[PDB]
Structures are given as C-alpha cells and as structure tokens.
Design a protein around this ligand. Sequence first.
Ligand SMILES: *[C@@H]1O[C@H](CO)[C@@H](O)[C@H](O)[C@H]1NC(C)=O
Ligand SMILES: *[C@@H]1O[C@H](CO)[C@@H](O)[C@H](O)[C@H]1NC(C)=O
Lengths: 197, 98
Amino acid sequence: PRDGLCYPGSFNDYEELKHLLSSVKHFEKVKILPKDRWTQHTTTGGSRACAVSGNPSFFRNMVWLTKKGSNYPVAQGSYNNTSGEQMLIIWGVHHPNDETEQRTLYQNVGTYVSVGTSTLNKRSTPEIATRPKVNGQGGRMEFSWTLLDMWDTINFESTGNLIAPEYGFKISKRGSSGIMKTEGTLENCETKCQTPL
Amino acid sequence: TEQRTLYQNVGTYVSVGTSTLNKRSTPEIATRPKVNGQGGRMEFSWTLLDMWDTINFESTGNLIAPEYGFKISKRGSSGIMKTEGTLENCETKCQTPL
Ligand SMILES: *[C@@H]1O[C@H](CO)[C@@H](O)[C@H](O)[C@H]1NC(C)=O
Ligand SMILES: *[C@@H]1O[C@H](CO)[C@@H](O)[C@H](O)[C@H]1NC(C)=O
C-alpha cells in the first residue's frame, strides 16, 4: 500500500492487529477523548509529512500534544469503557530527531508516556537519535494499541511526546472474515465464495 | 568503578538508526559470575541494511563499533549441518549428516 504511515515510524504488534481484524466485521467509532478537553496544551500541531492542500496537517484520529505558552503540564487522560463491547485504543510516542527538537516542541527532557489499564502497564520514553530522513522527517512515531475490556478504565499519563487518541474503535459485529491481498477493484457482482483471482 | 576507568561517563547510551530501524540501548551495570574470568558482558545486535540506505551510529560510551560489513553476494538454497565430521575429498549430489 502506498498510503501507510505518512509520518515515519513503526506500529508495535502490527501483525497481531491485522489478525484481530480477520474476525471483526464492523467498527463503531466512539469519541473517547475529545480534542477540546486538552485546554492546557496546543493541539494544532502538524507536519509536512502529513500535508494536505499544501499545508501541514496530522492524523485525523490522533492528537499531537504540544506546549502551550512555553508550558507543558502533565497530560491527564482517562476513559471508562461504557460502550457495551470491547474497544480498541491506539496511542503513540514521538521520537525527536535531536535534543533541540525536544526543547522547541515540548520543553521537557526525559519525558515519559505511560498507559495503564486493569491488565496493561506500560511506560515509554522518547529515543532521540540521528536517523535518515523519511518523507523529509528525521523523527519517528511509534504507535501502540490495546483492547479495553468490559467496564474497564484506561489512564493516559505523559509529560511529553504523547500522541493521544481522539476516537476509540468499538467492535460491534464479529464473525468469519479475512484480508485479500489483491490489486483489483470491487465490481457489481454477487458470490458465495471469493478468491484473490 | 569499571565505568570510570573505561569510559569516564555515566548513563551512556548506544543508539543505532536506519530508515526502518530505531534502537537506543544503555549499559546495565551489575554483579555477575565470572565467565572466562570476566564479570562484564557484551550484548551484540545486528540488522540488514537495504539498498542505498544509511545507518548512523551514535554513542557516549559502551559501543563496540564494527569495522566490516558482510555484504551478501550469492543467494540460493543452502543449510547448516550439525555434524562432528571433517570435509574430505569427495563429490556428491545429496548430503546427510551421516
Ligand atoms: C466504570 O463504569 C462502570 C459502569 O458504569 C462502573 O461499574 C465502574 O466502577 C466504573 N469504573 C470506575 C473506575 O469508576
Ligand atoms: C546514499 O547514496 C545514494 C546513491 O549514491 C544516494 O542516492 C543517497 O542520497 C545517499 N544517502 C544520503 C543520506 O545522502
């Protein structure tokens, strides 16, 4: 696929996530952390790697937290799963190219991005290093995911380099499915057995 | 104490980055049983560098930097034989450990 991660980076347990979708037939997006509540931080941050119409932009479902008025207070974020079914949540960590980028974007060094649920406990820290430029950007964005169970709570805590999510992907329909690796296009037709050919 | 006399810096890092790889590592100072008379350890990592790609090594200490890269030239069917024998003058088309 040509359109993957517009901002260079990786996706932890990406192959496992594609295996989960093989038994999921429908997602009902739920706004778990609206962009408006981040009133103590700047949420308009964008990159040329995500440019649309010649202007910097960013992923639609993710929020790039940034310093507001030369201040970066601790990012508090929580959501209690009340959607009635298991919900998939994706967050990310930003790795600046150099320590100067760290200062001009978050102003705090040695920041942490921690995510905790009733069954998950993770703390991540940015890795500042010199890397070859991909899509013109020297930084990287590492994205991680988890499944939030019934009536469970997920807490987001970070002093910097947190790409907080805005929407959760609630599973609604489950059943037999799969992924076709094909370059064809959908056509008006009906069948009971589909092959890539 | 070994940190001072060998690198003089504390909290050093060893970072390696390519177009598809991003790794930062730090030394782990601890007391371990002496193997080969040495209490220290060296952890060795590897990667495959693609066509026309760049790899950057940066470290403030504890880096065992390489001198040679192992370019792949010929590819094909091969294998690793687990045997105690020795090569001898002979020709064959099918080889078994026995
Ligand atoms: C989350 O919501 C459920 C149902 O409303 C409730 O039982 C549970 O106590 C809530 N979690 C917390 C941490 O309050
Ligand atoms: C590496 O070399 C190739 C071919 O010489 C070149 O196209 C590429 O730009 C070089 N990489 C960098 C980072 O300059």
